Every structure is written in structure tokens, then in C-alpha cells.
Design a protein around this nucleic acid. Structure first.
Lengths: 592, 256, 236, 253
DNA sequence: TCTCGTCCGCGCCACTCGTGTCCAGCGTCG
DNA sequence: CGACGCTGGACACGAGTGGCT
DNA sequence: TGCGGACGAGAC
């Protein structure tokens, strides 16, 4: 099997093995699945190819796949017998034929039909054809019938994947990707060997088939909004988002939502309301890209009004509300109220809390707010230790490589660009036993899971508090030999595994892992692993860009390497302060 | 075997020039009465009928009815070979498909014989009924051609409202809005500048202007054009072909 | 409403043909004295001045001055529909969003009406050269074939400087050519705009070119003593 | 030091315009007695031969042969703006100095001089020898130009089919096959419109209609064109030049 | 001029294709 | 005859789509 | 989210 069908078959197998996901489907859709399994290998390969490809008519001439078969007419015939493929005969919609036509062929048809512009933009010609189709013939019916016939004759044989089975497989992909085709998973998925864990599924995210269909609709809406954002079609994005908010409001009292409220936080991120709250966050993003900022702060207040969808991102929304309402809007007293609420909110953590604090101290120092005194009171005080700053002058290589070379001069010959993957890697290596530990409910659902669902969620610390606390103490009070053995044990046992925490290519060799672990020491690794274990979402970023150490000296320098146009991020400030508090020696490197 | 000599070869030349744009492949019916086109444009918005009576043709011969599907672009190219003066007899092959057109100069020194591929096209007859028309208008051909050109510069569609006072051609577009109206001049001399109109009921229609401009290409055939318009009935613009036959363009009303 | 009836509207057609090619947008300023249309070319090098007087037009009503900014690209097509012998009138109400023109053929059987949507200090030229415009058109076209710039000189010399070769043309007094020759003149101009000026010639039988050192050149066209068409040339 | 005065500069204008598109980057080998030119076409499939007698020009005084580097397109824009009635004189110094042309209109109210630099040139001098032709047909230049422009659409090649009774240009192509026949004139007027066939044996060779269309561009210069055909010999497209020269197009069938 | 803060584009790349511009052979009409 | 206008091939983009083991 | 560019806005 080639890679794309291998990925597809692994996704299908994983979803089918789930009894709950199978219950989520109707009997007909299981019929589509069992018909997909009832095809030749070339049939499956071509179906996966056409499925990865955009859902539009594709000319049989342009379908040239060397790996399946030199002539693919038998394969298309087999797929259209099976129902998945629609041949040109079911192409009775003029717009689809016109879009299928190439620019030269469309220009040729336009001359034949005496369009206004025989030459011009493809979309303009398509619209002109749609206008012409509605006119009356001299038969006194539809003129577009002749347009349809001529366009079909010109297009030639064309195929398109059926939307029914496509919806079935898209929903299958969504159910699989819940636990987490994307290109990273489209290729290599058959080869990626996932960590070992026992699957424990007690809670149902979806209740009825309609709930999963509704979740798929919400996910498709979110994907369309994100694609519009990426392509820069910001006005279309808002219209889709506004519709999406209208749909979210229409379903406000739907009985399925009452149980989505009772799903655990790490599972609640796979519900219709969760995706609509993410869609509203993207709605705030577009409102912010758009000039309007008043409806933006209104939607931030609306999202903030709920503690029950997306609490992990309340820091982001709090910072965006404060930023919009302060810089973009003249009023600052409600900014003070929002900030004093934000530092009070337990969900705001590790970088957005610092951002709110910095906004508060700016307002306190600023003469504009000097009349207000409520801000000074009840402002939690978390002063951040200043970090040593070193400036390096030098110069095509990456800036961080120049910093690596510079620290090679001052010792520190062994150095890796971790960028935060190094400390996550060491965290995974020293805590693989408890990150993937059994006996935590609903956090392993499918066998194809890189990370437990509790990870990136507050419940990861709470669920495994005994074991996590015990191991974190053990790492803190440990000799170099014990740490070396502990890291090497997991590098051996779980070699080649796939975890969102462990990047194997990050460390060139296990010997470098041993050396870096020895150099960092007990308390430093203990503190970093403790800050990553709890609230991993707000602590996974901002780690120092470069870790460097002299092999003989056993002395390290966790160095943040910022270019002349670069700045210290809030997460970076927090992490440098925390590493300094741990006994580590950190310093910011500026390279001009 | 079909044979028809035409002393005024410019008649056939301008006929093919007028018909070239609307139809690329048309059927040329062969009958004792004459040759009948009865084919429509590729867009099916417009229809053209070319009844060329055998009275004008000299030494007209037709053993049996012949379809004569002719690629009108190729025939236009072949007729462009002909001098405007040269006479043209069309010698249909007895049973094969090779329309032979021979052009002979009045000076008789030069003769130019050509054959055609004479392909076969799917025969189709609209057979529109001879519906009586209201508000028949008769105006010079060149005038109507000029109105079509001007309004095509102005707008994409043309609306026509006819009254006993006159007939009004108006177009509205992005760059402007325009209207032209003509009234029965009743000139005493009447060398076909007459704008005579017979009215039966007020009729207003909206028509596409691209095909209307394509209709103006038959200007050299006739100095006069008759516009007949009845509601829900396609416009009829007719060109009397030198008292030998007649060429008529139909155009279905635009819907909006 | 403001009305400017033109019994011989042909010259209006011709000036519109020139200005569509030269200028893109312009505003027709209407004063009771007359209609003046001077505006800036879409190109930096030249600006143009069209002057029309109220007395020349058959009808002249003007109570309020209207700029009537009109994209000449559309307006030229609108005036193109008018016949050479057609009587052209322009009607524009003081509160009219669109200017209107009406065309009436000499036989008066056909009436046409379209509405279209609407949006240099004097220096005494000591030396002046007048040549038949068709002639000046010919030098412009030929020297634009040869090159891109022409250096004009007095005794009537136009010199062609292109990388292909050199070309000189001489004109002498004798349809008539008159040069003051008050000072020697060596003024160079880009031939691109010079051939843009040439399109205006059907309007005037004689063209006037007056040179003054480091002073902008004007190609004035006399519109049947009814108005003047000034194109202002900025020397290189 | 070469001086040529041509009463009708229109003659040289049409010569250069008609011969412009056929041969690019050609050569000039003007003789001390008259003007003689010859070059293969840009695709080197056809040949053109030009001859201009010394006595035809009003005055003619030349000292030595010169390459006279030519960019025929440059010369074409030179003979542009030259009046049809304008008198054109070409004077050129030695050592490949720029060829300066003076156009004086008979009105004499205006006079113009243009000089174009001679560009680096090489003379290959094929010198294809002259030979007799089996059939020579005299037909009007306009008629021949129309015949070629007519067969161009319907055919890619033209069959000469000359005979004593007359000539018949036959063309076969996608849109059928066509043949236009011009018999012996047998006209009392003996006009230039007459077509006369001087031939000793019938001949049949197909010729590239494209290059024949290239040849017809000289139609304005000559009232009539004689065509000379011999088996396996490039056909002669001869246009009389005001009795001052003869221009011939050589195309190999 | 310097600094601090804020906003904005970001899969991968290589192959084919829509698009706009350019030059030019052909057609016009006076 | 020619000054001038025009719409059709040719070519470098900028974008989309697809293959990515 | 997490980065690298850019900009503006204030301080100077």
C-alpha cells in the first residue's frame, strides 16, 4: 500500500474499533464503509486520492496516477458502480460544468455562445454563462440546456466524489482526529508507532447521530473560517462566522447541550458548543482584523460570560479585551475593571496573567489613570526578576546558530537549539511513566493517540497528583547517575515512539541527552517538569531558545536568543524568571 | 444535381457575410422553390430564415431535395474569393458531398472553380408559426445598423417600445443610459428613407444587443429593414434580398 | 438646467476624440462667458486647455457653475454615436447627477438622447512657428518612428535623434508656414506626447507652435474661431 | 562617394517596403553602374534579386563598391513620410559613412533630410547563375496579388499549371480544392490587363503559397508581373520597375 | 534617534494553469 | 497609400492544486 | 498558539 491509503485505512480501523463511534453512525453510512472495504486495492487508492483532492469535478484526462494503473477507466467505473464516484452524466448543474472547464475551453465555449467577452476572467465568463442560461429561446423552456450540452461535450469525461460517502468519511476523520487528513498525519501515519497505553472509555462526547453531524457542521464552519483567514478573505470570513454565531444562538437550549455541560473539561473540547466558542474566538479575531472593535469587545464579554466553554483560553480573551478596550478604545476605567477581574480569574495563567499585570502597572504609572486609585489596591504583586542581558555583534546563518557559535567560544561547546522542544523532550523522557499512565478515565480513547487528552488541560496534574508529585520529588533529589539512567531507560524502551512532548530528532544522540541531563541537574529539571506537568498549555511555550553547556565544567547557560527586531515574550519572561528561581543561570542574547 | 447561376454574385457574398457570425454550420435546403436555410444560432437566442426563391436564379436545376450542410465560415472564405461582379453557379455533386462554386468574371477571361467539404449536420427544424405581428415598422437598413452599433457602445441590452407616433430604441448601462426614437417621416420622395409604421397595439420588449448587431451585418443586401413586434413573440427583422428572396432574423425577448 | 446647443457638433466630436486619448478625467467648467475645459493629463509631462465661448454655441444658459467631472473614456463613446452632420446639444440641470446630450439628425426624422454619469501663467512667446497641422502630424509620426525626442530650431527645423539614426526636416515660408525667428531656439521635447497632440489635428487646418527658452510650449488649435485647444508641453 | 537622384522616390519607397519583410539583415552590393541587390530569405528557402539601372535615376555618380550595411526596417521608416510625388536623393560618403537621404517635395515649401547609420554587414555573394525558363506568363500584378491572397485561405501550396491556352492556379486544402484559370487574353486592346503565355513545354510545380504572398507585396511598383517556370528551377517573379530596373523573386518548388 | 507596544503573514514546493500584458498581422476608410 | 484601429498568438507572472514515503 | 517581519506612537 502507498502512504495515503495506509493513513486512510489506519484512520478507518481506529474509528471502526470504537463501539461508540460506530453507534454514532446510521446503518446506511456503515454500508458506505463496508462498500469501501469491498473494493480492489486500486479502487481504494484512487478513492483516497480523490478524497484528499478538493470536492470538484476532475477531468479524466487530468487524472493521471502512475502508481495505481496506467489506465484508470476501470477504476473509475468500479468506484461509480460502488456509488462513491459520480460520472459526467450526473453533472446536470451548469455552474459545475463551467467551473470544470479550463480557461481555453471556456473561452472557446464563450465564442460559440456569443458571450460578451470571448476572452476574460474565468469567473466573469461563468457568471455571464449563468446569465445567458436563464434567457428564452426562439422556440416560442431553457437556453441553458444547450449551454449544458455543449459544455459537457467540451469538458469530456469527468468524475466527482459523491458527497454522501464523502460526508461519512469526513465524519470518520473528525472522530479519529478528535484524539489526534492533515499532511503530518496524511503521510507517515502507518509508520508512526504510538506509545503504549490501555484504552479506557467511560464517557460519551456525542450522544446521538445528530450530535456528531452537528459537530461536523461546526467543525467544517470553523475550517472554512480558518481557510478564509489564511487566504485573506476577511469579509467572507466574517459572514461565515456571523452565520455560525447565528447557528450557535439558534441551538442555545438544545437538550444535547445540557450533557455537554457535564462532560469533563478535557473531553468538552470535542463538542458542538466548544467549536462554536472557538468560532466566536475567531469571530473576535476577524472583528479585530476588521476596523470594528466595539462588537469585538462585546463578543469578548459574551465569551467571558461563560465559564463552561473554553476556560483554558480565558487568558487570551482577557488580554484581548483589555488590549482592545485600552489601546483601541479611549475608556480605561472598564479596562481597570477587566484587568482586576482577570488577575482574579483562576484560569488566567502564565503569560496572559503577566500581560494583564503589565497593563495594570502601565495604567498605574500612566498619568491618564493617575486619578484612579482602585487599580493600585488589590493588584496582586508578582514582580519579575530582571534577566542578565548580553549583546553579541556578528554576522548566511540563523541568529541562534551565531549565538551557539559564540557560546562555543566561551566554553559551552555542546549546545542544541531546543526552542522549548528540549525541555519538553526531557519532561517526556523523565515522566513517560505518568504522562501515559493507566487508570485515568476517558483520557485514552483510541490506540492512535500521541498525547493523553488530560495533557494540555489542568486535570493532568489533578488526575495523577500522587504519582506526579512523588516522581517530581524524586527527580529533584537525584544524583547525576540516577538521572542518566532514568532518561536512558525511556530513550531505550520508547525509542521511535511519537509523543507531542518528545521530539527524537531534537537531541542528536542519547549521549547528548545524558550530558544535558547531568548538566541541568536535579532541581532545574524538577522545576521545569513540575511547571510543564501542571497547566502544560500555558507553560509549553516561551522556554529559553538555546541550552548550552561545557562538558568539563558541567555549567550551563539557558540563553534566550533574540534578534534586533525581536522581543521578550511574556511566556519567555515567566520562564526565564522561573529558571532563575531554580538555580539555573539564564541570560538574554541579542545578536545584531 | 443542383445548379443555380446568379448574375448578381454580390447577393450571395453579402448573404454569407451576414450569416457567417450567427451560424458556423447550417443546412441549405434544396427545393424547386429555392434554397431555405431555417437554422438558428449556437446560442439559440436568435433564428435566421433564408428563403432565396428560384425566380431570381437563372438556370435553376434541382433533381431532388438536398440537405447541403455547409460550414458557413469556409463558404464565407470561399465567397470572399469571388469578385463582387463575378457570376456564381453552385453545382451540387450528384450524390457525394462537394458543393462546387464557380465564379466567372464578366470579362470572361478568369474562371474560378472551388469545391467544399460539405459536411453533414444534424437536421433540425424550428418551424415557427407565421404569427401575425403588431406595430410593424419599416425603416432604412443602415439606420438600424447604426442604432445597433451606438447602443452596443452604450449598453448590453436594448428595449423597444412601439407606438403609432414612433418606435423607440433605448439602452441603459454602467457608463450611461441612452434612447433613440424614430417617427414616420412620410417623405414624398420616399427613396426608402420612409419610417412608415402600422400600429395595432402597444408592444414593448427587451432584446439582447449582441445578436442585434449580428443582424445588422445583412445591411448590404437590402436598403430597408422591417421590424415587426408583438408581445411574447420574438422580434422579426427582415431584409428583402434584391427581389430574389428574403432573409429574416428572429430574436426572443430578454427576461428580467 | 444648462444647455449648450451646437449646430455643427462635429468639432465637439473631434475635440472629444483628442481628449479621450490624452486625458482620462476632466471637469467642464461652465461660466456665462463660456465653457472652459482645462485639466491635468494623467501623464506628468502635459496639461490641456479647451476653451468654448457662450456666443459660439446657439444656446447658452448658465446660472450656476458646474464642474461636471466626467470620465472622458465613457463620454467619447457617448459622443461617438453622434453623426458628423448631427446637431449636438448638452443639457445639464444644476442639480443633475448625470449630464445629458441629445442628437438630432439634419433630416430631423431620427432623434437620439443619451444621459451619461458625471463624477499656466501666460508668457509672451517672442518667436512663434505655424505649419499646416497635417504637416506637423507627418513630422511627429516620422520622428517618432526614428526616435523619441525632437530638438526644434529656428532659421523651421525639426531634428530627429534616435539610436537608429538622425533626421532633419526644414520648412520655409511661401498651408502657410510662418516663424518669427525673434530669438534662436533649441528646445527638445519627448515625441510620445507630441504624437498624442497630433491626434487633435482634424480639428484645425493650421497648428501653432511657439518657442521660448526654458518656457513651456503650447500647440494651440484654432477651432473655427469658435474656441481654442491648447496643449501645454513641458520641455525635457 | 555615391550619389543617386530618383525622380519618383515612391519607386524606392515601394521597393524597400515590399522587400522589407522578405529578407532581414540582408546585404547591399550596389555597382558603379546601377543598383544590384540579392539575398536569401530569413529562412533561406527563397531568394530575391534586385536590379536598378544607373540611367534610370536623374543623376548617378559612384566611385567604388561598398558593403553599405543595411537594416531594411530602418530604411523602411526612412522612406516613410516621404511623399509619393516627393523627389528623393541618396548621397553617401566613403568608408561606410551614414547613408543620408534628402526628400524634396515638388511644392518645395518643405524639404527634409534623414541619415541612417550603416550597420555591420557581410557579403556572402551567392551569385546564382541566370538560366532560361520553360514557361513565362505575363499577367497583371494586381490580378496575381489577388490570386495569391485568394489561394492563401483555401490552400497552402499553389499549382502553376501553365499551358499555351492559358494558366490555371490550383489550390487544395482543408476547405476544399480550388482552381482559378486565366486563358490566353485574345484581347484587342493589348492592355496591361492582358495575360500572355510564352512557353515551349507545359510544366507543373507546386510553390510555397506563403512566400508567393510575400512576393505580391511589390504589386504597387509594377503594372504587370512576368512569372518564369522551368522544371526543378526556382520560379521567377519579375516586376518591371518604371523601366529603371527589374526585381525578381526566386522560390524553389 | 531610541524604545515600547501593537499588528500581520505564516504548510511544503514544484507543476500546471488563469491572467494580464505585450507585439503584431489583418482590416478600415478616407 | 497609408494613418490608424483592432483582436488574436506569445510570455512571464501569481495563484491553486496536489503529492508529500 | 507561536513565531519572524513591519508599523506607529510616545519619549527624546
Amino acid at each position: 500500500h502507498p502512504y495515503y491509503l495506509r493513513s486512510f485505512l489506519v484512520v478507518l480501523k481506529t474509528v471502526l474499533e470504537n463501539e461508540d463511534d460506530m453507534l454514532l453512525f446510521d446503518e446506511q453510512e456503515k454500508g458506505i464503509v463496508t462498500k469501501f472495504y469491498q473494493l480492489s486495492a486500486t479502487g481504494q487508492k484512487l478513492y483516497v486520492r480523490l478524497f484528499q483532492r478538493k470536492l470538484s469535478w476532475i477531468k479524466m484526462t487530468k487524472l493521471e496516477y502512475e502508481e495505481i494503473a496506467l489506465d484508470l477507466t476501470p477504476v473509475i467505473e468500479e468506484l461509480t458502480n460502488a456509488g462513491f464516484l459520480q460520472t459526467e452524466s450526473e453533472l446536470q448543474e451548469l455552474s459545475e460544468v463551467l467551473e470544470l472547464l479550463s480557461a481555453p475551453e471556456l473561452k472557446s465555449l464563450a465564442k460559440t455562445f456569443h458571450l460578451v467577452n470571448p476572452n476574460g476572467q474565468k469567473q466573469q465568463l461563468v457568471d455571464a454563462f449563468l446569465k445567458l442560461a436563464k434567457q428564452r429561446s426562439v422556440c416560442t423552456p431553457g437556453i441553458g440546456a444547450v449551454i449544458l450540452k455543449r459544455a459537457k461535450a467540451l469538458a469530456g469525461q469527468s468524475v466527482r466524489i459523491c458527497k454522501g460517502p464523502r460526508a461519512v468519511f469526513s465524519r470518520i476523520l473528525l472522530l479519529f482526529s478528535l484524539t489526534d487528513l492533515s499532511t503530518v498525519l496524511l503521510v507517515n501515519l502507518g509508520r508512526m508507532e504510538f506509545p503504549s497505553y490501555t484504552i479506557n472509555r467511560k464517557t460519551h462526547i456525542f450522544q446521538d447521530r445528530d450530535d456528531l453531524i452537528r459537530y461536523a457542521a461546526a467543525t467544517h464552519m470553523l475550517s472554512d473560517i480558518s481557510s478564509a483567514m489564511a487566504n485573506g478573505n476577511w469579509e467572507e470570513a466574517k459572514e461565515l462566522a456571523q452565520c455560525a454565531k447565528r447557528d450557535w444562538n439558534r441551538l442555545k437550549n438544545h437538550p444535547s447541550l445540557r450533557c455537554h455541560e457535564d462532560l469533563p473539561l478535557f473531553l468538552r473540547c470535542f463538542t458542538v458548543g466548544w467549536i462554536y466558542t472557538r468560532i466566536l474566538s475567531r469571530f473576535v479575531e476577524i472583528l479585530q482584523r476588521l476596523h470594528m472593535y466595539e462588537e469585538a469587545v462585546r463578543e469578548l464579554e459574551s465569551l467571558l460570560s461563560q465559564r463552561i466553554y473554553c476556560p483554558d483560553s480565558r487568558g487570551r480573551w482577557w488580554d484581548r479585551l483589555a488590549l482592545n478596550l485600552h489601546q483601541h478604545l479611549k475608556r480605561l476605567e472598564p479596562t481597570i475593571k477587566c484587568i482586576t477581574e482577570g488577575l482574579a480569574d483562576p484560569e488566567v495563567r502564565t503569560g496572559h496573567r503577566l500581560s494583564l499585570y503589565q497593563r495594570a502597572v502601565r495604567l498605574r504609572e500612566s498619568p491618564s489613570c493617575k486619578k484612579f486609585k482602585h487599580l493600585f489596591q488589590q493588584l496582586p504583586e508578582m514582580a519579575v526578576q530582571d534577566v542578565k542581558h548580553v549583546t553579541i555583534t556578528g554576522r548566511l546563518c540563523s541568529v541562534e546558530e551565531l549565538a551557539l557559535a559564540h557560546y562555543r567560544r566561551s566554553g559551552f561547546d555542546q549546545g542544541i537549539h531546543g526552542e522549548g522542544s528540549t525541555f519538553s523532550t526531557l519532561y517526556g523522557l523523565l515522566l513517560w511513566d505518568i504522562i501515559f499512565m493507566d487508570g485515568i478515565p476517558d483520557v485514552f480513547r483510541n490506540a492512535c493517540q500521541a498525547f493523553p487528552l488530560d495533557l494540555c488541560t489542568d486535570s493532568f496534574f489533578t488526575s495523577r497528583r500522587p504519582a506526579l508529585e512523588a516522581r517530581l520529588q524524586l527527580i529533584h533529589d537525584a544524583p547525576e547517575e540516577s538521572l542518566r539512567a532514568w532518561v536512558a531507560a525511556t530513550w531505550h524502551e520508547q525509542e521511535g515512539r511519537v509523543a507531542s512532548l518528545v521530539s527524537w530528532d531534537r537531541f542528536t544522540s542519547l549521549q547528548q541527552a545524558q550530558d544535558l541531563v547531568s548538566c541541568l541537574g536535579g532541581p532545574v529539571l524538577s522545576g521545569v517538569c513540575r511547571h510543564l506537568a501542571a497547566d502544560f498549555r500555558h507553560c509549553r511555550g516561551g522556554l529559553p531558545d538555546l541550552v548550552v553547556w561545557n562538558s568539563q565544567s558541567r555549567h550551563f547557560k539557558l540563553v534566550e536568543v533574540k534578534g534586533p527586531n525581536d522581543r521578550l515574550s511574556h511566556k519567555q519572561m515567566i520562564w526565564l524568571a522561573e529558571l532563575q528561581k531554580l538555580g539555573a543561570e539564564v541570560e538574554v542574547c541579542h545578536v545584531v | 444535381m443542383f445548379e443555380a447561376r446568379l448574375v448578381q454574385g454580390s447577393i450571395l457574398k453579402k448573404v454569407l457575410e451576414a450569416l457567417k457570425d450567427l451560424i458556423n454550420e447550417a443546412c441549405w435546403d434544396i427545393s424547386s422553390s429555392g434554397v431555405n436555410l431555417q437554422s438558428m444560432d449556437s446560442s439559440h437566442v436568435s433564428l435566421v430564415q433564408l428563403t432565396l426563391r428560384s425566380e431570381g436564379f437563372d438556370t435553376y436545376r434541382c433533381d431532388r431535395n438536398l440537405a447541403m450542410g455547409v460550414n458557413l465560415t469556409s463558404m464565407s472564405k470561399i465567397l470572399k474569393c469571388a469578385g463582387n461582379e463575378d457570376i456564381i453557379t453552385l453545382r451540387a455533386e450528384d450524390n457525394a458531398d462537394t458543393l462546387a462554386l464557380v465564379f466567372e468574371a464578366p470579362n470572361q477571361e478568369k474562371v474560378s472553380d472551388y469545391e467544399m467539404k460539405l459536411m453533414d449536420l444534424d437536421v433540425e427544424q424550428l418551424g415557427i408559426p407565421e404569427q401575425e405581428y403588431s406595430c410593424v415598422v419599416k425603416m432604412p437598413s443602415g439606420e438600424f445598423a447604426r442604432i445597433c452599433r451606438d447602443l452596443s457602445h452604450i449598453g448590453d441590452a436594448v428595449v423597444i417600445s412601439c407606438a403609432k407616433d414612433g418606435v423607440k430604441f433605448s439602452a441603459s448601462g454602467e457608463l450611461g443610459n441612452g434612447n433613440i426614437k424614430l417617427s414616420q417621416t412620410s417623405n414624398v420622395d420616399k427613396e426608402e428613407e420612409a419610417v412608415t409604421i402600422e400600429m395595432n397595439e402597444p408592444v414593448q420588449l427587451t432584446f439582447a444587443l449582441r445578436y442585434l448587431n449580428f443582424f445588422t451585418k445583412a445591411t448590404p443586401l437590402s436598403s430597408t429593414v422591417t421590424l415587426s413586434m408583438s408581445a411574447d413573440v420574438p422580434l422579426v427583422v427582415e431584409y428583402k434580398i434584391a427581389d430574389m428572396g428574403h432573409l429574416k432574423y428572429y430574436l426572443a425577448p430578454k427576461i428580467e
